[PDB]
Amino acid sequence: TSVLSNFENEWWAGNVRMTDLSGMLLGAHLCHAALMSVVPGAFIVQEVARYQPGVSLPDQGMIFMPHLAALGVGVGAGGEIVDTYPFFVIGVLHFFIAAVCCAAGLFHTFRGETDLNDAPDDSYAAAFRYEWDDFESLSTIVGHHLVFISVACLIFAVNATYGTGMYDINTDTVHQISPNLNPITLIGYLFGFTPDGWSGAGMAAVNNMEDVIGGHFLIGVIDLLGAAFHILYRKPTPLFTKHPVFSPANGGWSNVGMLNSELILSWSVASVGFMGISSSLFIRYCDVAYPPVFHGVDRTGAATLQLILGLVWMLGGGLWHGLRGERLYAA
Amino acid sequence: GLPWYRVHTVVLNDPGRLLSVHLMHTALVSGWAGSMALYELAKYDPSDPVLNPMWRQGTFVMPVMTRIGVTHSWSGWTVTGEPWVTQPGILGAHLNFFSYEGVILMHILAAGLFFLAAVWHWINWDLDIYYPDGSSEPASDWPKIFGLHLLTLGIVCFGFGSLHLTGILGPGMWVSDPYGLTGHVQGVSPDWRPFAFDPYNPTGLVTHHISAGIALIIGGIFHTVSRPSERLYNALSMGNVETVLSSSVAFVAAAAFVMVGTMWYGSATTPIELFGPTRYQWDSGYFQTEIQRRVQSGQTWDQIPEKLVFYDYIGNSPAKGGLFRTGAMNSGDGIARAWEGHPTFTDSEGRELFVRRMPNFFETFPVVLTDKDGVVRADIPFRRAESRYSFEQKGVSVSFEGGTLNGQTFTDAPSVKKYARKAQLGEPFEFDRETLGSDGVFRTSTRGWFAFSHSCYALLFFFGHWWHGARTIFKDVFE
Amino acid sequence: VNDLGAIATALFVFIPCVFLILLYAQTASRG
Amino acid sequence: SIRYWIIHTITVPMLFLAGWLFVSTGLAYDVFGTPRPNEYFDQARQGLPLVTDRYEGKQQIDEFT
Amino acid sequence: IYTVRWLAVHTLGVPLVWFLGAIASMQFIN
Amino acid sequence: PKQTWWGDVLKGNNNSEAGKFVPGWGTTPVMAGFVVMITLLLLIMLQVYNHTIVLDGVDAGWTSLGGF
Amino acid sequence: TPNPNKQPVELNRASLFIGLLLVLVLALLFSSYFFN
Amino acid sequence: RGWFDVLDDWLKRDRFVFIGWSGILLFPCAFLSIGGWFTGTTFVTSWYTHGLASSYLEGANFLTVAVSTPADSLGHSLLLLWGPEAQGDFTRWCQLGGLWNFTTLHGVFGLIGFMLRQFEIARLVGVRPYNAVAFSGPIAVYVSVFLMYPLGQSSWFFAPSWGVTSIFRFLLFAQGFHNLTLNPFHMMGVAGILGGALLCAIHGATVENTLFEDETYSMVTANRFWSQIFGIAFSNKRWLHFFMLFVPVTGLWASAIGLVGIALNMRAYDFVSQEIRAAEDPEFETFYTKNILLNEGLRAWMAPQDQIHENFIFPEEVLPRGN
Amino acid sequence: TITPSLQGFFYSILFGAIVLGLLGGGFIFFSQKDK
Ligand code: CL7
Ligand SMILES: CCCCCCCCCCCCCCCC(=O)OC[C@H](COP(=O)(O)OC[C@@H](O)CO)OC(=O)CCCCCCCCCCCCCCC
Ligand SMILES: CC1=C(/C=C/C(C)=C/C=C/C(C)=C/C=C/C=C(C)/C=C/C=C(C)/C=C/C2=C[C@H](C)[C@H](O)CC2(C)C)C(C)(C)C[C@@H](O)C1
Ligand SMILES: CC1=CCCC(C)(C)[C@H]1/C=C/C(C)=C/C=C/C(C)=C/C=C/C=C(C)/C=C/C=C(C)/C=C/C1=C(C)CCCC1(C)C
Ligand SMILES: CC1=CCCC(C)(C)[C@H]1/C=C/C(C)=C/C=C/C(C)=C/C=C/C=C(C)/C=C/C=C(C)/C=C\C1=C(C)CCCC1(C)C
């Protein structure tokens, strides 16, 4: 099925069988998202069930409550959990999202048409036809997903600034913090250029909520602009086409800029692993975004967990799928 | 005919008779379990749970029974130090039935039933199932049979972990304090936090048997469905049962070694209330440290719980026995009856010195009473020698706190010498030999016998694994 | 000494011995 | 034959001297912690430096050092 | 020319020669 | 060759697929990973038992019995 | 129905002597410890 | 032909030596074990664990160099170069005795690799692998002496330090503290080894002295000679050589079981009736009692310095003597 | 929380992976070379 390595039709590899089946692939992703959303809500409800008021969160071993309390959910002045009901509401809403995703996945796996190339010729569904070769098709997908991520980030920032704000570590309580919008100052962190001097952990030495909220505004605007870029153009440019790549497809650097299913998957996997490593640094050092009132002070274990996951995705998955895609570029 | 060391190969090609001999072996094993437990019951003294526990009494299977729930007897007595109350009142309270005698009865019944099944399968060796659809030669598929067996064992492991061990639907398991004082049979709750890998915390065991249980079930299901691979199938010769024998023997040897390790080093599975103290608790001064801290914590000497002082005797160590010193420990130094109390020694100048305790290694030790500062004060010279630092020349009194010799002060040189030797043997104690004709030479507890026997078994079974692997891999040659 | 020492020695001497003699006899009777 | 003779002549004595100087320059004592002949004891430090604790052995040696 | 035998011969000889030199050096220590 | 009832029940599990294997390597690669995984697991346990590894708040000794 | 797999058991005279020597020598060695 | 078949054929290719798959485990592990021993004797000293000078730098002799065991305080710690003890410091790793663990563990895996290698070679040639089963004995001895014994004791400190005089110290220590010579399993081991030497000697002499004037020797003459000289003789060649194989291996296994027994102090240290009878009257004196006295003396005179960590202090008065 | 001993074990896994990878890479690469 669009691959001939040695073992394409093995049951333990059977997911590759959906390489071209667009409808089934969409269903599979939706079901997976159902899993990813079931876990948080279920474990939040389980946590709130055993939560004790006198003891502090770091001493209760909660791995989802701290992230919710960091956003001012159910906490008051002094950083103590007051009311537990909003955590329960968050869990229930994740249950709802998971149920909707699972319904969609069941529809597209069984009721929906397996391959959208078999859609009835502009039936609201041919507009969703995509091919792992044509660039234009996948461009609009990237654009719309960027739209959603950007709207999420902007919503987070707007909530922080105007409505009910976040738990600011320095001010000791939940406040609508006034954002900092000095773009050079924000983008300096990416090279470690913190105001207090260069720092080893980029983006992680922020010492005030204003920096993070301004950065989120910047990221939201940037992602919205990129969404416009990809939705409105869909055409390959001399950046993607005609860029150097080293591969045994042709021994040595080439300017081909190849495209393939495994290659797209590999770039995505590498991106995820990189985010894992960046988050590892973040939770190791940045305690503005992780108030030790909630997550505790010692946080080497969580950072190491993130590190391992990031290495597995960036090195293992990224390399494996990149090599397979480059080899499949011998068609 | 066959050589005497190959007589049992006459069942190699016969699945029915192979199953028959396995069933007969199972019948023998269950019968031995029953008979051994019966004998131990018939030679037991429930009166004294403190200075004569089961491990002092040469019990072998009673601690293994007691580990996971069985404590009382139909005659009434419990091993925890209280007459058994029939707290059972309802169904799911078979606990009044599954005492020692209930387990014995069930095991003997299983022995009989398995023996009958073995006879049946020996006679009906040619059932149609052993033969494939269209070939006279009997042929079994070992991979799927392994899958079925593994699934069964995974179900039973998951049930044991989740129901029996947790106490939800079972007696639970034996738990205790760090010093072997309070011993309950209570349920445990599983926790997946990393401290469940601590071997001495029982919460791991449940957490193991649940998760591992599930792992076997999945592992069963896969093998009940999945076929082998030509590569592996040809390499390991999966069509030949001898490979199963080789791999199983290796596994069982590894299991024996791991069990010996836990038994010798102690763990949550082996509590000292059941199997007795290890040899490292004497070496590290574990109980002496604890007692000394407790007394130093303001408690008077007579207020020290007698189990905690019995554990500090060196006669309890499993590293003081012998290979042919047979029988229970009480056949050795005799059965204890009373603790004479903690003795203290003083010399002419009134300085308080202490006796150095004999390590596990030495069969005999030279008695040396030394100043706490590391200077030898007095001693007992060799059997007949002239001295300058001596017991009498310097003169030594001994005074006893608590116990039978409370407040007493022996300054009679033979008495001081006797109690010096006792003090270097741990804690002085009242031992009786007249009841059993005890020989005064020590013996090892249940823990030592376990460790020795199964280390020998593991060592032999490794050679067995090598031999059977050789006969599997070289099958074409070994004919 | 051990009252069971003599019994253990006797059974150790006897059981393998009777086993071996039985095997040899039922071998030699056969041609 | 002949070719390798040049390489071995150039190299082997250099390796021999490498070991020689590794001992002579006293580097081995630092690498392996082996005491100098005067380092076994001070003028009166005739006590033995025996480790008594498993957990902090290296630091205890540093005290013995 | 890097045969497995070359590796083996060198992995043996190199440390062997180094240690022979070291021991010789120790022989001349007072 | 008695045709018992229980034999009828169990013959399919006994030798329906007797002597059948899939060609090549099949699932053997996946098995490899599992082995390596347990090779870590056991190893970790050993060191935890050996006090080479000291997990935080996990005192591998008789003191851990505190709480029973 | 007879079982094909049945086979007799053989032990010649020399093997009997070897086995008896092994057994008697082991008994002589270990009796001094069994009596303890 | 995948990469695996290429690798397999490459391993099995004829060379000066045969590598096989087993080589991947044998050669690195064997080489590391040998190198560890050589380094430990040449440079590393035991001044901090046993208070000895057991290295050439110290000025020791070939008969007195030893890779001495780790200290007593470490218990049975594996002493990894990166463990809680060494913590990555090579010098502390050497001083603490980590070279002993390095050498012994890599030796274990070298022995395992060698047994696997014999399995593989016999598989290639196509003959019964009796050689591997024979080699099973040495592995039993090694595992019993260097692993099971120190594991049954307090620490690695009681294992045999890799050396010559250190091994002699181990022998004398075993006699003093476990009374090993009186252990029946050691007696079977001694009988096995001495009988193996006897079999080798007389088999060689017989084959040389019944050579045909050209298998190659008169089995009939040898059989008659031994029957009329000694009484019994091998009339079967296969039995003769299987017996030659069987005797020393069995001796090694019996000794292995003896050594695992004494690892738990489950030792045959004394005969109870003799101790009782000696207690009743002092005139009763036998060789066993004097052996007991020698054991007492060796324990007393060796303990203060052998187990230096224990800080034993026995005065002259308590030391046993022949007065 | 990570302790020094656990970090040492993790570095051990790194080094062991490196050693095994270099050994296996050398073996497979040399086998592929003189095919
Ligand atoms: C001692 C090393 C060893 C081990 C532990 C071992 N085998 Mg063997 N072994 C077999 C099964 C077996 C099982 C099921 C099993 C594990 O449960 C073992 N083995 C294990 C049979 C398939 C096959 C033939 C079996 C066979 O013919 O057995 C005949 C044996 C007889 C009449 C008596 C031998 C005397 C023993 C002193 C018995 C003493 C009582 C007993 C100890 C009580 C304790 C119980 C328990 C704790 C041990 C076999 C062989 C054989 C040998 C040899 C040399 C061995 N083995 C060796 C081992 C064949 O020649 C021979 C062979 O294969 O040649 C063709
Ligand atoms: C649970 C109940 C258990 C009850 C006990 C069971 C006991 C079973 C039998 C045990 C003894 C078996 C003996 C077989 C004896 C026997 O028949 O041997 C001869 C036999 C010959 O094998 P073949 O295949 O050539 O012929 C087989 C037939 O002759 C007999 O089946 O070979 C072996 O058995 C190999 C092992 C020899 C072992 C002995 C070698 C050493 C001999 C000398 C040692 C003592 C002297 C030492 C002087 C210092
Ligand atoms: C295309 C190409 C390739 C790939 C090259 C690579 C690897 C390109 C890498 C591209 C990357 C990593 C792009 C990512 C850029 C990251 C950006 C732009 C992050 C911006 C984040 C900002 C601005 C946030 C800032 C904040 C916001 C945040 C909320 C916190 O409050 C902190 C604070 C305030 C710093 C090859 C390898 C195929 C060939 C190359 O030659 C060319
Ligand atoms: C043979 C003999 C009999 C007749 C007389 C005669 C004089 C000739 C006599 C010979 C005597 C002589 C001079 C013998 C010389 C012998 C010697 C020293 C041989 C030594 C070779 C040295 C070797 C391998 C060392 C290898 C070292 C290794 C891997 C190091 C391993 C390492 C360790 C130990 C710590 C961690 C780091 C690392 C690198 C993994
Ligand atoms: C028959 C019948 C049918 C219907 C139900 C009913 C209950 C009535 C049933 C009756 C069942 C009964 C009474 C079953 C009794 C079974 C018994 C007692 C089985 C035997 C157990 C004894 C065993 C294994 C022997 C072990 C002996 C061994 C190792 C040999 C040597 C020994 C070893 C190697 C270790 C050291 C000690 C020693 C002795 C040297």
Q: Nearest 5 degrees, angle CA B351-CA B356-CA B357?
A: 140
- Burial class of residue E1 in the structure, from the number of CB atoms within 10 Å of its CB (0-12 exposed, 13-18 middle, 19+ buried): exposed
Dihedrals phi, psi of B338, to nearest 5 degrees: -160, 150
Question: SS3 of B75, please?
Answer: coil
Domain residue limits, chain D: 1-65
Choose from B317, B326, B389, B466 for mutation: most chain H CBs within 10 A: B466
- For ligand 2, the distance from its centroid to the CA atom of residue G16, given in whole angstroms, is 8
Which residues contact residue A73 at a Cβ distance below 8 angstroms, ignoring those fewer than 6 apart? Answer: A86, A87, A90
DSSP string, A220-279: HHHHHHHHHHHHHH----TTTSS--EEETTEEEEE------HHHHHHHHHHHHHHHHHHH
G21 neighbourhood in chain C, CB within 8 Å: none
CA separation for the pair A51, H75 (Å, rounded): 43
- Coil/strand/helix, residue H249: helix
Instruction: Flag whether E touches D (3+ CB pairs, 8 A cutoff).
Output: yes
Closest-CA residue, ligand 2 atom 29, reads G11
Rounded Cα–Cα distance for residues A72 and A200 (Å): 30
Task: Kindly state if the Cβ of B117 falls inside 6 Å of ligand 5.
Answer: no
Nearest in space to B236 (alpha carbons), one of B471, B410, B472:
B472
| Nearest-angstrom CA–CA distance, B162 and A126 | 52
Residues of I in contact with F33 (CB under 8 A): none
Q: Is B247 left (phi over 0), alpha (psi -120 to 50) or beta?
A: alpha
CA B50 vs. chain centroid, Å, equals 18
Q: How far is D35 from chain E (nearest CA, A)?
A: 14
Does ligand 1 lie within 6 Å of residue B464's CB atom? yes
Substitution candidate for ligand 2 out of G13, G16, G20, G22 with most atoms within 8 A of CB = G22
Do residues A146 and A54 touch, judged by C-beta distance below 8 A? no
Long-range contacts of B256-261 (CB under 8 A, 24+ apart): B256/B454, B256/B455, B256/B457, B256/B458, B256/B461, B257/B455, B257/B458, B259/B450, B259/B454, B260/B450, B260/B451, B260/B454, B260/B455, B260/B458
CA distance A102 to E30: 84
8 A C-beta contact, residue H162 and residue H172: no
* Exp. method: cryo-EM
- Residue D8 known to bind ligand: yes
- Identify the CATH number of the domain in which residue H8 sits: 1.20.85.10
Apex CA B256: angle with CA F41 and CA F35, to 5°?
Answer: 30
Regarding chains F and A, contact by 3 or more CB pairs under 8 A is answered as yes
Instruction: Sort C26 into a burial class: Cβ within 10 Å, 0-12 / 13-18 / 19+.
Output: middle
DSSP A56: -
Distance CA B263, CA B199 (A): 12
Q: What are the two backbone dihedrals, phi and then psi, of residue B61, each rounded to the nearest 5 degrees?
A: -95, -25
Which one, of F24, H45, A277, lies nearest residue B227 by Cα?
F24
3-state secondary structure of B184: strand
- Cα–Cα distance for residue pair F27/B226, rounded to 1 Å: 9
Closest residue by Cα to residue B51 from B436, B339, B435: B339
Among chain H residues, CA nearest to I25: H7
* CA pair distance A5, F24, nearest whole angstrom: 14
Q: Nearest-CA neighbor of F47 among D49, D39, H84, H205?
A: H84
Contact between residue H81 and residue H61 where contact means Cβ atoms under 8 Å apart: no
Ligand 3 centre from A225 Cα, in Å? 15
Return the SS3 of H89.
Answer: coil
Contacts with B385 (C-beta within 8 Å, 6 or more apart), sequence order: H317, H321, H323
In this structure, what is the dihedral angle of CA atoms B220, B225, B231, B236, given to the nearest 10 degrees?
Answer: 40
What amino acid occupies position B442? F
Q: Is H181 on the interface with E (CB under 8 A)?
A: no
Which chain C residues touch B1 with a CB distance below 8 Å?
Answer: 27, 30
Beta pairing partners, H67: H162
Under the phi-then-psi rule, with left for phi > 0, alpha for psi from -120 to 50, and beta for the rest, what region is B478? Answer: beta
**Structure-token pair, residue A95:** 């249950």
Rounded CA-CA distance H59/H52 in Å is: 11
Cα separation, B115 vs B182, in Å, equals 41
Contacts of H224 (CB under 8 A, 6+ apart): H233
Distances in Å between the Cα of B33 and the Cα atoms of A133, B78, C20 are: 71, 21, 29
Residues of chain G found within 8 Å of residue H188, distances taken between Cβ atoms: 29
CATH number, domain with residue B427: 3.10.680.10
Calpha distance A41→A68 (Å, rounded): 12
Distance CA(H79)–CA(H101), nearest Å, equals 7
- How far is ligand 3, taken at its centre, from the CA of residue A67, in Å? 25
Give the number of C-alpha atoms closer than 13 A to the C-alpha of residue H295, restricted to the C-beta side. 23
- Containing structural domain, residue B374: 279-447
The H-or-E segment that residue B175 falls in is: strand B173-176
**Can you tell me the distance from the alpha carbon of B223 to that of B220, in angstroms, rounded to the nearest whole number?**
5
Report DSSP letters for H29-62, one per residue. HHHHHHHHHHHHHHT---TTTTS---STTTT--T
- Chain I residue numbers with beta carbons less than 8 Å from the beta carbon of H24 are 23, 27
Give the residues across from B431 on adjacent strands.
B336
Q: Taking the CB of residue H255, how many other CB atoms lie within 10 A of it?
A: 26
Judge: H15–E5 Cβ closer than 8 Å, yes or no: yes
- B2 three-state secondary structure: strand
Chain-centre distance of CA A290, in angstroms?
Answer: 18
Helix F28-50 to helix I4-33 angle (10° resolution) is: 150
Q: What tokens appear for B172 in the block?
A: 């639970």
- Give me A20's structure tokens: 């071209």
User: Which of H37, H42, H45 should be substituted to probe chain E, the one whose Cβ sees the most E Cβ atoms within 10 Å?
Assistant: H42
DSSP string, B352-381: EEEEPPP-SS-SS---EEEETTS-EEEE--
Specify the 3-state DSSP secondary structure of B431: strand
Q: Which residues of B touch C23 (CB under 8 A)?
A: 4
Any idea what DSSP says for residue B339?
E
For the record, the structure tokens of I1 come out as: 């929380």
Question: How far, in Å, are A77, A179, A276, H43 from residue A286 at the CA level?
Answer: 22, 18, 15, 48
**Across chain H, where does the E strand assignment appear?**
66-67, 162-163
CB of B219 shorter than 6 A to ligand 5: no
Task: Say what angle helices I4-33 and H3-12 make with each other, to 10 degrees.
Answer: 80
Q: What is the CA radius of gyration of chain C?
A: 14
Resolution in A: 3.3
Residues 6+ apart with CB under 8 A from A255: A242, A243, A244, A245
Report which DSSP code applies to B78: B
Q: What is the DSSP code string of B399-416?
A: EEESSTTTT-EE--HHHH
Rounded to whole angstroms, the Cα distance separating A191 from D17 reads: 49
- For chains A and F, CB pairs below 8 A equal 7
Cβ(B449) – ligand 5 distance below 6 Å:
no
Residue B347: which H helix or E strand, with range?
strand B342-347
Report the distance separating Cα H5 and Cα I32, nearest Å: 10
Task: Give me the residue label for tokens 């006590």.
Answer: D47
Nearest to A59 by CA among B472, F57, H37: F57
In the structure encoding, which two tokens stand for residue H130, read together?
A: 């009796």
Handedness of CA D11, D13, D15, D18 (dihedral sign): negative
Locate tokens 């079901």: which residue?
A31
The helix/strand/coil state of B327 is coil
Query: How many other β-carbons are positioned within 10 Å of the β-carbon of residue H196?
Result: 19
Owner of token pair 């079994």: B140
I14 in contact with F, Cβ within 8 Å: no
For B165-195, b/e burial (b = at least 16 CB within 10 A) is bbbeebbbbbbbbbbbeebebebbebeeebb
> Domain map of chain F by residue range?
1-52
Question: Of A209, F11, F48, H66, which Cα lies nearest the Cα of B133?
Answer: F11
Q: Which residue type is seen at E4?
A: V
**B402 vs B390: CA distance, rounded Å:** 28
Beta strands B183-186 and A193-194, pairing class: unpaired
Phi, psi values for residue B95, rounded to 5°? -60, -25
Whole-number Å distance between alpha carbons of H151 and B451:
12
Yes or no: say if B53 and B277 are a contact pair by the CB < 8 Å rule.
Answer: no
Q: Answer whether A304's CB lies under 8 Å from I2's CB.
A: yes
**Which residues, including other chains, have CB under 8 Å from residue H133's CB and lie 6 or more apart?**
B466, B467, B470, H249
Residue B72: beta bridge partners? B78
Contact criterion met (CB below 8 Å) for B101 and B34:
no
Whether G and I touch, i.e. at least 3 CB pairs below 8 A, reads as no
Tokens describing residue H138: 């040495």
Which member of H6, H28, H83 has the closest CB to residue I32? H6
Tell me H303's DSSP state: H
What count of other Cβ atoms lies within 10 Å of the Cβ of residue B288? 17
d(CA H229, CA B76) in angstroms, rounded, equals 73
Q: Using most ligand atoms within 8 A of CB, pick from B106, B108, B457 the residue to mutate for ligand 5.
A: B108
Cβ–Cβ below 8 Å for F24 and A7? yes
Q: In angstroms, how far is CA G16 from the centroid of its own chain?
A: 7
Whole-angstrom Cα distance, residue H12 to residue H117? 12
Show the DSSP H helices in H56-129 as ranges.
Answer: 90-95, 98-125
Q: Are A48 and A91 in contact (CB under 8 A)?
A: yes
Given a contact as 3+ CB pairs under 8 Å, which chains touch G? B, C, H
B335-339 and A197-198: which strand pairing? unpaired
In angstroms, rounded to a whole number, what is the distance separating the alpha carbons of residues F9 and F5? 6
Do residues A99 and A105 make contact, with C-beta atoms less than 8 angstroms apart?
no
Length of chain B measured in residues: 479
User: Phi first, then psi: what are they for B142, rounded to 5°?
Assistant: -65, -40
Q: Which of A132, A327, A133, A318 is nearest to A247 (CA)?
A: A327
